[PDB]
Write a protein that holds these residues in place. Structure first.
Motif, PDB file in Angstrom:
ATOM      1  N   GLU A 267       0.811  -1.215   0.000  1.00 19.23           N
ATOM      2  CA  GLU A 267       0.000   0.000   0.000  1.00 19.23           C
ATOM      3  C   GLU A 267       0.861   1.291   0.000  1.00 19.23           C
ATOM      4  O   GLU A 267       0.496   2.310  -0.616  1.00 19.23           O
ATOM      5  CB  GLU A 267      -0.905  -0.028   1.238  1.00 19.23           C
ATOM      6  N   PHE A 268       2.009   1.237   0.667  1.00 21.62           N
ATOM      7  CA  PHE A 268       2.885   2.396   0.764  1.00 21.62           C
ATOM      8  C   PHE A 268       4.178   2.233  -0.056  1.00 21.62           C
ATOM      9  O   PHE A 268       5.289   2.601   0.360  1.00 21.62           O
ATOM     10  CB  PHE A 268       3.182   2.678   2.242  1.00 21.62           C
ATOM     11  N   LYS A 269       3.976   1.696  -1.253  1.00 27.56           N
ATOM     12  CA  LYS A 269       4.989   1.430  -2.262  1.00 27.56           C
ATOM     13  C   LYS A 269       6.396   1.998  -2.128  1.00 27.56           C
ATOM     14  O   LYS A 269       7.272   1.351  -1.574  1.00 27.56           O
ATOM     15  CB  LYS A 269       4.436   1.836  -3.637  1.00 27.56           C
ATOM     16  N   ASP A 270       6.638   3.187  -2.641  1.00 31.52           N
ATOM     17  CA  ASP A 270       8.001   3.695  -2.600  1.00 31.52           C
ATOM     18  C   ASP A 270       8.340   4.698  -1.483  1.00 31.52           C
ATOM     19  O   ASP A 270       9.497   4.980  -1.272  1.00 31.52           O
ATOM     20  CB  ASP A 270       8.321   4.368  -3.951  1.00 31.52           C
ATOM     21  N   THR A 271       7.329   5.201  -0.776  1.00 30.47           N
ATOM     22  CA  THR A 271       7.506   6.224   0.239  1.00 30.47           C
ATOM     23  C   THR A 271       7.390   5.828   1.712  1.00 30.47           C
ATOM     24  O   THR A 271       7.858   6.572   2.573  1.00 30.47           O
ATOM     25  CB  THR A 271       6.493   7.300  -0.017  1.00 30.47           C
ATOM     26  N   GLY A 272       6.789   4.671   1.993  1.00 29.63           N
ATOM     27  CA  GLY A 272       6.565   4.260   3.359  1.00 29.63           C
ATOM     28  C   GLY A 272       5.461   5.205   3.850  1.00 29.63           C
ATOM     29  O   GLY A 272       4.816   5.877   3.041  1.00 29.63           O
ATOM     30  N   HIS A 273       5.254   5.321   5.157  1.00 32.36           N
ATOM     31  CA  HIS A 273       4.217   6.191   5.649  1.00 32.36           C
ATOM     32  C   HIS A 273       4.419   6.550   7.131  1.00 32.36           C
ATOM     33  O   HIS A 273       5.173   5.876   7.831  1.00 32.36           O
ATOM     34  CB  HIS A 273       2.874   5.474   5.467  1.00 32.36           C
ATOM     35  N   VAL A 274       3.724   7.598   7.578  1.00 34.40           N
ATOM     36  CA  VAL A 274       3.778   8.033   8.980  1.00 34.40           C
ATOM     37  C   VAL A 274       2.370   8.370   9.468  1.00 34.40           C
ATOM     38  O   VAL A 274       1.557   8.989   8.770  1.00 34.40           O
ATOM     39  CB  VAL A 274       4.512   9.396   9.242  1.00 34.40           C
ATOM     40  N   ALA A 275       2.086   7.958  10.675  1.00 36.74           N
ATOM     41  CA  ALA A 275       0.817   8.320  11.288  1.00 36.74           C
ATOM     42  C   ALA A 275       1.204   8.719  12.728  1.00 36.74           C
ATOM     43  O   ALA A 275       2.308   8.353  13.209  1.00 36.74           O
ATOM     44  CB  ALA A 275      -0.162   7.092  11.320  1.00 36.74           C
ATOM     45  N   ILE A 276       0.291   9.435  13.397  1.00 38.53           N
ATOM     46  CA  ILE A 276       0.449   9.789  14.804  1.00 38.53           C
ATOM     47  C   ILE A 276      -0.533   8.931  15.511  1.00 38.53           C
ATOM     48  O   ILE A 276      -1.667   8.839  15.071  1.00 38.53           O
ATOM     49  CB  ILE A 276      -0.013  11.242  15.176  1.00 38.53           C
ATOM     50  N   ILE A 277      -0.097   8.283  16.584  1.00 37.98           N
ATOM     51  CA  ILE A 277      -0.983   7.492  17.418  1.00 37.98           C
ATOM     52  C   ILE A 277      -1.691   8.543  18.286  1.00 37.98           C
ATOM     53  O   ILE A 277      -1.064   9.225  19.099  1.00 37.98           O
ATOM     54  CB  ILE A 277      -0.184   6.494  18.261  1.00 37.98           C
ATOM     55  N   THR A 278      -3.005   8.654  18.092  1.00 43.59           N
ATOM     56  CA  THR A 278      -3.857   9.635  18.740  1.00 43.59           C
ATOM     57  C   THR A 278      -4.625   9.188  19.989  1.00 43.59           C
ATOM     58  O   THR A 278      -4.886  10.009  20.879  1.00 43.59           O
ATOM     59  CB  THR A 278      -4.868  10.221  17.693  1.00 43.59           C
ATOM     60  N   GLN A 279      -5.008   7.918  20.055  1.00 50.99           N
ATOM     61  CA  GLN A 279      -5.712   7.387  21.237  1.00 50.99           C
ATOM     62  C   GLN A 279      -5.477   5.889  21.463  1.00 50.99           C
ATOM     63  O   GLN A 279      -5.436   5.113  20.514  1.00 50.99           O
ATOM     64  CB  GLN A 279      -7.224   7.623  21.132  1.00 50.99           C
ATOM     65  N   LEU A 280      -5.285   5.500  22.708  1.00 45.76           N
ATOM     66  CA  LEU A 280      -5.135   4.103  23.031  1.00 45.76           C
ATOM     67  C   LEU A 280      -6.499   3.684  23.619  1.00 45.76           C
ATOM     68  O   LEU A 280      -6.805   3.992  24.771  1.00 45.76           O
ATOM     69  CB  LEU A 280      -4.063   3.884  24.074  1.00 45.76           C
ATOM     70  N   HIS A 281      -7.316   3.000  22.808  1.00 45.28           N
ATOM     71  CA  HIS A 281      -8.658   2.564  23.218  1.00 45.28           C
ATOM     72  C   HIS A 281      -8.565   1.091  23.589  1.00 45.28           C
ATOM     73  O   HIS A 281      -8.930   0.212  22.812  1.00 45.28           O
ATOM     74  CB  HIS A 281      -9.656   2.753  22.055  1.00 45.28           C
ATOM     75  N   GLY A 282      -8.061   0.808  24.774  1.00 48.44           N
ATOM     76  CA  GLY A 282      -7.955  -0.584  25.143  1.00 48.44           C
ATOM     77  C   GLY A 282      -6.971  -1.323  24.257  1.00 48.44           C
ATOM     78  O   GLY A 282      -5.777  -1.039  24.273  1.00 48.44           O
ATOM     79  N   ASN A 283      -7.476  -2.269  23.475  1.00 48.09           N
ATOM     80  CA  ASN A 283      -6.633  -3.078  22.604  1.00 48.09           C
ATOM     81  C   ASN A 283      -6.472  -2.555  21.199  1.00 48.09           C
ATOM     82  O   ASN A 283      -5.737  -3.126  20.404  1.00 48.09           O
ATOM     83  CB  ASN A 283      -7.172  -4.487  22.526  1.00 48.09           C
ATOM     84  N   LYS A 284      -7.192  -1.484  20.892  1.00 47.74           N
ATOM     85  CA  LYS A 284      -7.124  -0.842  19.592  1.00 47.74           C
ATOM     86  C   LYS A 284      -6.195   0.387  19.700  1.00 47.74           C
ATOM     87  O   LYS A 284      -6.110   1.041  20.735  1.00 47.74           O
ATOM     88  CB  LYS A 284      -8.528  -0.392  19.136  1.00 47.74           C
TER      89      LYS A 284
END
Lengths: 582, 571
Positions: free
Chosen positions: A113-130
């Protein structure tokens, strides 16, 4: 772009649907630069841009603007913006005993899905196991009402270890980054294979591409350049050099990090008279130099960092933050060079130079009208004109002053130019030291402050009378003379001992320096002075090549090469054509 | 008037201050006579004190408390480094001292002779051998000779290692020079004001029925809002008032300026250490934003109020409310009415310049052109909001008062807007920050990366916290101002300036009232004066002194409902 919703802290999430655009809009690349006040966040509306912006707005920190998201996993610091503090950042692989936390950067390697660039996300909330995350350039449809996350990832805890599962199945999560001093469970910083840092020679096919006038004399900038050099860039335009895309990525990280390291060293110098005394700056100017640093640390427009780069690694030699040049050669002349004779798929790393300078000037505190002050010298002509182009592109009006003759004072003792226009904002090509020399005999025990002129028999204005005038805002700021002085190298070393980009340096000869062999450099033989471990430049196709990077507003502005037959590059040594290749 | 006479070293202009040529009424009050450099107040054009602050500012980035008369400068023991607000030690040496004058030193004249009541100040600009060249304003009134960067040269006699300077006038007294140094050798101990002058006195008016009717104007919206919350009342007996000496006021001016900086230093210490910060009971989720606020907006506070205990024993601060201070209206407007309607003496109400000081602060702020004033639906807040609105108008700002949160909403782009659809991006609030804190007290900083504020809602319901914590909204007072008013700061303040003359010994452990984990502070009760315990309060405006008012109560502890008491400062 389209507003999809907001991540926690009121941070907007946008769709980067370049589609709805025509190529006519995409002609002005200023419309794609995302800023928060005067701080450049990134390109609208990329993943890297959302992460920097989120960290910036919620915590006031950012990380080096690397070209691709997977590259973030190799960074080991976050930059606290207000004071430029270097904060430790650790990396943890997916499956780590260090659990992910709220605010952590979550990085994807390239692939699927993130072919040549990779990706970054910010972890915004820890909802238990999600694990809820927010990110740009994945979702492109508005989010449900009140939803402040883009995706939810399941996390599995087995045997004290944490593993996140992506929502895509052909991807690879590298892991999470936490800003903390605790290194337990962290990945050691990746080290680039030495081979990729080698500078190689190359040759163009000789079809006479450069046999006549290849720079246009009708363009005043290029003709000004031709008046000072002729139709010449280097000795043989059919010869050029290449570096790998990986080497450039390393230069981009090093440039940004070294800039912050020099600011820390500059601050250490300025807080101690015993250290400052080593820089040979008139004591009478100390209060103004300190004042400049305290309020204009962020006002530097551009500088240049020179390195030694080969299979051994990357080492900085110097950082001229005051009077850096070579911008015209790298950002304009090399572009014509490439145009005229290069046909490969690589690129001139300083291509973005002009655009980067314009953004710096747009987001500076410069006044609407900027007076450009240069010496009556042919090379400075084109340097001044190249900068004038960046100023105009950013919306400033300008007047170039060659020498000091047309400056005078009005009836109220305020400096005016030849048209009688008040001078209050200067960008200079003059080194500050030239101004220092005019008051080197002014004692700080005799005078309360610098006795600059505000009027004179023959209406004779000196450089120092304009640069030190309180009503004149000067670029580069006064504090920029600190970085380029070799007296700072011992200091930089003590603050970041054994840093991969630094050379062992001290005010005394260590036992490390004896074993390693060292150079004695006066404040230059090989074996009050500084002593530095030996580390000479590689020789590539009959010349010693030095790699240089431009800083613009503290960020990377490009790279160029300087070469010479001697082992010591001089200001007269040539810029060599450079092309970055895969 | 304002003629350029030349420049002192560093490019500092020397101006002539010939008032004569025009109005008295306006030289004082018109903003056109206030000298500034960027946003920093220098002085009154074109006085001696003004030239000294600006010389020091432009050349070194430092100033000194803006005392009323030059001679008082001699009593100061620090200079303020503006950028970071550092307190730099300043020492005083008498004329005839073994400590020689240095270039850059402040040279102070006591009152007397050519310098009648004010005294005088100059800066030593050049040490030319045995002469000492100075630069000053309000002495020379004709342009200087071309290229001369000093207003007077004075002879210095060096006999037996002691330096004595001779003035150019012969009926004057030169107190000495001041040097910014940590070395106290040969220096003068800081003068102490005689306790007698720090006493608050009761007084009464000749009762001719001046207060029998409506002395406040109910046709004036501001004054009428005050009456709707209080009636035609300032205190229980308007024929009764209190006075303090001009010397005590001078002491309160200095203390106020010094204590603001000291509280900034204790705030920094608090914010630099989690252990300290946890004592303030501020939701941890708010910590990074609170620190950002401190780091970027330390100079953005508009107004606060310091409450002291003042009498023969000295001056002691109890508290500094930098977030939600009030009493401005009573002190700055109602007491003006009161004095006008019934006082016929020679003294003045020390908070009389409050409205103009606030207008200046707003004009020199980074506030946006349109400012929304946010108040809760509360009767006393109505007049405090309107008083502040008046200062915003005077400073050139447009405004709209929001009462409660109901008219607030979000547009299609999730941006906040008022009932008229105007974007809300700059707010001055009467609401305390803590009211907002309370709305997110249960948000864990382990679960959430940042505060989950709303940017939309089923019934377009906007909470106070959804506005104040919005990045696009510029809020006054800044979020960091919650730190100075919390009692937990008293022990930090003490540790940073132990035995400072204005502080009360306070610690977390017992070294003795106990205030609620507790803080223990030395016993130090308010004086009772004509039947009431009286508290002295000064307003800070942009970190500077904005006036004094009194609050009194029958009980030893003043409450917020405690009464403001008419106050007159007399010779």
């Amino acid at each position: 772009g389209t507003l999809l919703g907001y991540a926690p802290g009121g941070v907007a999430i946008y769709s980067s649907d370049y589609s709805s655009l025509d190529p006519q809009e995409y002609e002005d690349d200023a419309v794609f630069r995302s800023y928060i006040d005067d701080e450049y966040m990134g390109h609208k509306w990329q993943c890297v841009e959302f992460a920097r912006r989120f960290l910036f707005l919620n915590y006031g920190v950012v990380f080096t603007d690397v070209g691709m998201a997977w590259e973030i996993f190799s960074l080991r610091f976050l930059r606290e913006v207000v004071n430029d503090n270097i904060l430790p950042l650790q990396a943890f692989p997916n499956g780590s005993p260090r659990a992910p936390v709220a605010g952590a950067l979550l990085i994807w390697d390239k692939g699927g899905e993130f072919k040549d660039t990779g990706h970054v996300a910010i972890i915004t909330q820890l909802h238990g196991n999600k694990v809820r995350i927010a990110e740009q350039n994945v979702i492109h449809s508005p989010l449900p009402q009140g939803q402040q996350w883009t995706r939810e990832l399941e996390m599995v805890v087995e045997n004290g270890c944490y593993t996140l599962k992506d929502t895509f199945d052909d991807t690879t999560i590298l892991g999470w980054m936490i800003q903390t001093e605790d290194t337990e469970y962290s990945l050691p910083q990746p080290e680039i294979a030495g081979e990729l840092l080698k500078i190689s020679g190359a040759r163009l096919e000789n079809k006479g591409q450069f046999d006549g006038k290849w720079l246009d004399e009708k363009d005043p900038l290029q003709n000004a350049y031709v008046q000072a050099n002729g139709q010449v860039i280097n000795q043989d335009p059919y010869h050029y050099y290449t570096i790998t895309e990986s080497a450039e990525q390393e230069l981009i990280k090093a440039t940004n990090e070294l800039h912050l390291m020099y600011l820390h060293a500059t601050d250490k110098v300025l807080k101690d008279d015993n250290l400052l005394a080593l820089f040979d700056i008139p004591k009478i100017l100390w209060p103004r130099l300190r004042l400049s640093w305290q309020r204009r640390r962020h006002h530097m427009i551009t500088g240049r960092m020179d390195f030694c780069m080969d299979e051994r690694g990357l080492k900085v030699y110097e950082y001229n933050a005051d009077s850096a040049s070579c911008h015209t050669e790298a950002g304009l002349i090399l572009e014509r060079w490439a145009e005229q004779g290069y046909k490969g798929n690589g690129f001139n790393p300083a291509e973005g130079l002009i655009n980067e300078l314009a953004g710096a000037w747009k987001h500076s505190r410069a006044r609407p009208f900027v007076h450009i002050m240069q010496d009556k010298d042919i090379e400075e002509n084109y340097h001044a004109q190249f900068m004038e182009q960046a100023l105009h592109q950013a919306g400033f009006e300008t007047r170039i002053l060659r020498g000091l003759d047309e400056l005078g004072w009005d009836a109220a003792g305020q400096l005016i130019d030849g048209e009688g226009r008040l001078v209050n904002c200067v960008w200079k090509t003059w080194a500050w030291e030239t101004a220092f020399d005019q008051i080197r005999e002014v004692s700080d025990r005799e005078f309360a402050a610098v006795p600059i002129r505000t009027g004179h028999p023959q209406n004779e204005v000196r450089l120092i009378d304009v640069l030190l005038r309180p009503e004149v805002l000067v670029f580069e700021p006064l504090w920029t003379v600190i970085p380029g002085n070799k007296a700072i190298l011992p200091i930089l070393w003590s603050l970041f001992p054994h840093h991969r980009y630094l050379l062992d340096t001290d005010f005394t000869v260590n036992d490390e320096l004896v074993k390693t062999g060292y150079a004695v450099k006066p404040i230059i033989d090989l074996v009050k002075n500084i002593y530095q471990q030996l580390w000479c430049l590689p020789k590539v196709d009959g010349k010693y090549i030095q790699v240089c990077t431009f800083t613009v507003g503290g960020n990377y502005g490009g790279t160029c090469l300087r070469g010479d037959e001697s082992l010591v590059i001089k200001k007269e040594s040539d810029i060599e054509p450079l092309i970055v290749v895969k």
